[PDB]
A paper describes a structure:
VCCN1 was recently identified as a voltage-gated chloride channel residing in the thylakoid membrane, where it plays a key role in photoreaction tuning to avoid the generation of reactive oxygen species (ROS). VCCN1 structurally resembles its animal homolog, bestrophin, a Ca2+-gated anion channel. However, unlike bestrophin channels, VCCN1 lacks the Ca2+-binding motif but instead contains an N-terminal charged helix that is anchored to the lipid membrane through an additional amphipathic helix. MdVCCN1 forms a symmetric homopentamer, with each subunit consisting of three domains: transmembrane domain (TMD), N-terminal domain (NTD), and stromal domain (SMD).
Numbering used by the authors:
A (entry chain A), B (entry chain A), C (entry chain A), D (entry chain A), E (entry chain A): 78 to 418
Amino acid sequence: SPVQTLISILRIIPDWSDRTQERGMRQHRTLYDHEKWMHHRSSYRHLRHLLSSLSSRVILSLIPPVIAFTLVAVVIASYNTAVALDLLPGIFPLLRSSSLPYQLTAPALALLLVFRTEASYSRFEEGRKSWTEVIAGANDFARQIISSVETSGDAQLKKALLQYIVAFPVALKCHVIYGSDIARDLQNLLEVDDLLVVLNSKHRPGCIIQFISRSLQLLKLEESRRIMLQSKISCFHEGIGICEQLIGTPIPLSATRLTSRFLVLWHLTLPIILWDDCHWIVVPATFISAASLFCIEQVGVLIEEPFPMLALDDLCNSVRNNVQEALASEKLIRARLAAKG
Amino acid sequence: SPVQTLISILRIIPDWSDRTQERGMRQHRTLYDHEKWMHHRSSYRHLRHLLSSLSSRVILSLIPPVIAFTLVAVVIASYNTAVALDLLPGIFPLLRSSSLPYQLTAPALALLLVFRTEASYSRFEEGRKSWTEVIAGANDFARQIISSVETSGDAQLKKALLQYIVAFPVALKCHVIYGSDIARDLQNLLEVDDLLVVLNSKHRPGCIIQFISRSLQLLKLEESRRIMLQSKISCFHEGIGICEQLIGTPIPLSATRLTSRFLVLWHLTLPIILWDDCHWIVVPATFISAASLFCIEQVGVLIEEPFPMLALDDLCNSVRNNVQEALASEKLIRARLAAKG
Amino acid sequence: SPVQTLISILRIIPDWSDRTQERGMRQHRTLYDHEKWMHHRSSYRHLRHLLSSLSSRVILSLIPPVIAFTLVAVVIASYNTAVALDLLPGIFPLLRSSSLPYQLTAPALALLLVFRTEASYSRFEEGRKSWTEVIAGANDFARQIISSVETSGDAQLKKALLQYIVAFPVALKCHVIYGSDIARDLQNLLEVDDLLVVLNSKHRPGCIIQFISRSLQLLKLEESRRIMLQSKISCFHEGIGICEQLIGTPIPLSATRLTSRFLVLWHLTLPIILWDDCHWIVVPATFISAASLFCIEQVGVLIEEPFPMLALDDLCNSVRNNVQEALASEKLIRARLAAKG
Amino acid sequence: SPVQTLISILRIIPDWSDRTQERGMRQHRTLYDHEKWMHHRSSYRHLRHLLSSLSSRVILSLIPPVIAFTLVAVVIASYNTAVALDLLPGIFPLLRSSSLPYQLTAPALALLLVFRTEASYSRFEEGRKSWTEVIAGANDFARQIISSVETSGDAQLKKALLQYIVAFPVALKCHVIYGSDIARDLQNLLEVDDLLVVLNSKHRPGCIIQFISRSLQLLKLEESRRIMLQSKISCFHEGIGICEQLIGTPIPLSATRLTSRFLVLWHLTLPIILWDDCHWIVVPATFISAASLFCIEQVGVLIEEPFPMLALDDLCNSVRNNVQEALASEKLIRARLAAKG
Amino acid sequence: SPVQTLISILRIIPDWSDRTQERGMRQHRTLYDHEKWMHHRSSYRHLRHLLSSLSSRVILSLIPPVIAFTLVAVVIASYNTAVALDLLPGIFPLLRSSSLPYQLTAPALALLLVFRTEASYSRFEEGRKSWTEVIAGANDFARQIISSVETSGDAQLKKALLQYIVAFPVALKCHVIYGSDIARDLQNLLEVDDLLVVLNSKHRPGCIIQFISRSLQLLKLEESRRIMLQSKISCFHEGIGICEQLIGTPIPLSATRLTSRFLVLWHLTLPIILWDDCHWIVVPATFISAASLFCIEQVGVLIEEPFPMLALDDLCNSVRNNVQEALASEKLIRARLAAKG
């Protein structure tokens, strides 16, 4: 109890930081337009970023490691100040050291920290390209289905097939985001009986592909045209593959634990080597170093699995908006090209 | 009012800098030719870049953050000089510190600043390749349409289809540049009734694709030849996808706010750590450091969304010039190859 | 014997480290899901990584080089302390040097160490993409076989062909992992007589491809449809090629021996240059430098051949689970699309 | 005149440097073979590069910026020496400063300089791959035309078509090199009347493509075989696109002017901060720093537009040599494969 | 003679180093297997690399530049020691300087050295991927020929065609390795009369392609199947293109001479700036700096043209072994799939 009521009060702050950053992963993102870019490039961005630093969830996640190292700096400083005043027995030395060992290893720590964050940014870029390809393939496939499928006996199957190409990016988004309601997001895109078959499947994006693939086998098409249409499905399998490996396989964990351990050991003895030159400036110096260096690691950690930093709902809605515009433009494009003739 | 007439005079300079850089985003760019490369590689480039530094809009955007840090250096220096002359009560210490904490963290700041600018340059390169592919696909598709389409009953549809392949890059350029007049830019490329249907569409580059796709369904072609032609449309969907994700999804904003915050905190205490070694040289030193380090961040910020730094009007005009040269060379190439035979 | 009983006691620790890390290469990995990402991003990761540092097998592999350099620091320190007390003849100088030569070469060592680890991480990423492509191709090929193959006379050949597409990733996994039992892993995927032919082949993933390729020649298909199906086999040859070159061709060994030699020479004279500023702090300083710098090299060494850090059994089971779900959804998707009609 | 006869004598050296480097862009390059690699890897390369440093045109281009900064170092040193001897009124201070501000910003300058040169090398690599693809596509297309085209009535058209595939890389080389004589380079590759049509076209590589595309429409081919042959033309459009964007779009000029300005300001005050430690060694120190740091920038500037550093004439001659060897081997390969049968 | 008998004794060591490294380029390499990876990752690699440092040919190539700089350090040290003892007239100053100029430029030298070696490693990776693609294409093409070619009248042509797909990687290996005996390496792969036609061709890998391309025109195939088979030849043209550009076009030589010149000037004045702090420790310090920094450049130089560091004979033998296993498995796979039916 005496070691169990103190081990629980120490968890109050890290638990709050953990609850705060997870709520920030569930925030809804929006695509940038032109006026958001003007605000992004403004000369006031430096002041407004500094003023928004106590509402940023990166900095709130950094509160446990920054306070822990700052108390260690205060403890080392208090002990050193007490020794300098001869308040201790005399066997107790001053916890000081040369900064030369840290000068030699300072560029290695920086290069390793930036390497891990560059590896994390590469995973964000790969996630962004994969979604770009899936949305451009869904737009392309839908555009070709509106042109290719001519026969009036295939009106219902063409309608059904265009509903599954719009539903596929929504299914993939629900497959990669933790609390997702695919039933709610597909309620007005799929038929009531089509959505029951998808909801009974463990791999829902896989199930929509199978409806698309079976629909292309039932259309009255020449075989050359069908091979052209069913070659557009492979981008959906590629999308599923790339997105599932980014959630399944993180950056090799030996590299991420090395960056953690190196940053913890460096900030544990940093007050000891800074003492001769700084004295009690070790406290604010350790505070600023821990806040600056653990924030480079925190940025990389938060974008390592990148699907919650992407506006997947706005990208999915673009395909739906593009397909309904094209079904309304069809009579007026057909008329104009018949007039040409 | 007393705190509201001073909060407004402080906005005069950042508002001017913001109006100056946005006007520089709307400047018209031209493709480099050989004599511009000779001028670019000249030994006078070092002098002429230095002389053009007060007309460069990067440096004008840097005027608010550089003056703000320079006044902070002047305030810290004035306070320190007043303390050294014993003009203050005596409880007021000298704002000085060891430079050793900044020596240890100097390589981390540099690596992070160059990482953000490299990420911005990667987005410029991706925007450049995407336009290269769309212009080469428009040239290829047009070249094949001039060869493939033979039948004299399809003369008007071939004319119409070649107008939409030239119009597509203009539509995509108007779709990614903020103040664009697609009606003015397509006035002499599309028919009056064809341009009305495009102007009524929310996704105009999408609408031109649908005219191309419907035109290929109405041509008297063998099915194998039609599949070959409609496979050339996918580069247009890819172009739309890549260009829309560069405007919709910026570099993850946690990484860009970290570079901003780190640069602001570093220049706020930089006069304090430089005092013992520099005294009033903290003012020009802080001026040069803020101007040098915030300019690396400013370059990255301005090319992060890269379409205004690209000569999209000259690249679009190349496709138009290439297609009209090919329609004039057609009778003389046909004659020469008939002579061979 | 006197030089042969001491040369054997020195091998006790490196042999134990070598047996410990190899047992860690044979540990079974699991795909990350959402709750493992929450635990990965927690604010307690910094404390729990530090507490798990004496059970991490990277650090146990670092035990021989870190102790060897720490004893060298103790030997140099003991000799220097004995000279300072005039316990030696007097011809014996103090083993001290300026740190200026190491200050000039410190950034070169860091850049080279991070380059070798970045090259190793690039090989891990290439291994990860190759598996992503092979699993997405196996999913795509299986999905098309379930749609394409219609004829009821080809029921047994379609069953057989879907067993070989699920078996191929298991065969490739057994081909790249050292102690593998392909007979045990293919016992319930292949027929008893089909598995005997695969087990008699030296290149088992190659043998499964040949069964797939022969099965596509015996199906009653139109030739255009067969060419479409046999074009899906090339991703399996590409998978075999990429995976075999990662095991056959390491990072050029001249670059890896340079990083080893540079790190050994740097830690051999590091106590000599640190003495004037540190005295007996050369022992913990050399301990921390050797542990920090050889751990960056160790991470790169352990992920250089990356297939044991990948959850190849879970990725292989995903294809098997996806194909059996699709064979159970087939009657209910066929019914729904017939109802449409 | 007094300010106009001195402004002209100062241009003598930069004009000479500009005339010298442009003449080096027009030098003819040759492909490396095995004995040039042995000479390239020799242990004498370090001495022979140092001895050839006053004939290297990079160093001659660096002569204006290196002399300008060296005279500034001499002026600052002369003024400081005159002040130390009390030869001035006494209101004149010594132009000295702490080197600490430059120590903090030294790693930022290095990282930015190497980033710009890496961006320039990436443009050289992209230019090299684009030429590799165009030459391999010209070899592939020619090889297929020699096999595919069988009919004896198409002998003259097959001859003509193989002349245009060899002529296309020569036309593209003349299109990207400033003083080119396409008439002289195509005089023995094209017919006299075919070369007149190409010379009358503004986009000559585009004109050759149109002859190839029209020749494939006039051959007596099955449609499936023609689609296979005309799919080999797209690599030529891709080649034109990639090569034209490298000449049209340089590295964003905001990034290149920042590297210029940073290097000029750094070498202007470098004698002032080096004085206390170096005195008149500021002159050779500034000379070596300006020569070393402006040479990293000069290398990047000279390879930024890379087509003059590539042996485009030797790569073009390889396609011509490969096609004539294949037309002489045709009777003896046909005989051997008929003997098999 | 007096200046000609001394200019020849100085060439003894660089000539020996040049003869030693070229003999190391001709050593035969073997593919890594699992037990070589265990030995590669062992904790004894740090000791065994250090012990093998006087048999490594990188270090033997470094012997001329390391001895030359070490004698310069000995000459500068001897002159400085003689001046300190007043053994000279007195007009002779001490060759000493501040290390501050080298501290500012130390990170630029390191970044440039690692950039050149990263560029060299990128050329090794490109060479490795190109061979991976050619071997996977040869495996794929052979696998399809064994399935596709059915007719019993084409037995000899199928045999011949499978001999040319195995012979092509051997021909490409002989085309990129300096002393190669293509006649000896193709003696048991090609027919005696087929090998005479290949030996009479200047571009032997090109000649084998032409036999493959002519063999596919003589087979009794449907045209759709022939187009599928002749599309597998393009990877051979791509392989030839990528491999020839790596031997023809080195890293731009302006960048490689800059790294050479910078490293030579840096080690020439390094004893002068290290003297005040080191005295005769300038000799071992210059020895270690020259050995460490010129070894990073030497690694890059030796892998810049990478084909001799690749096990091209083992990769070529894998295709031959895979094709003969598949011709022996053909009767037993045909039997098993006929039993299914």
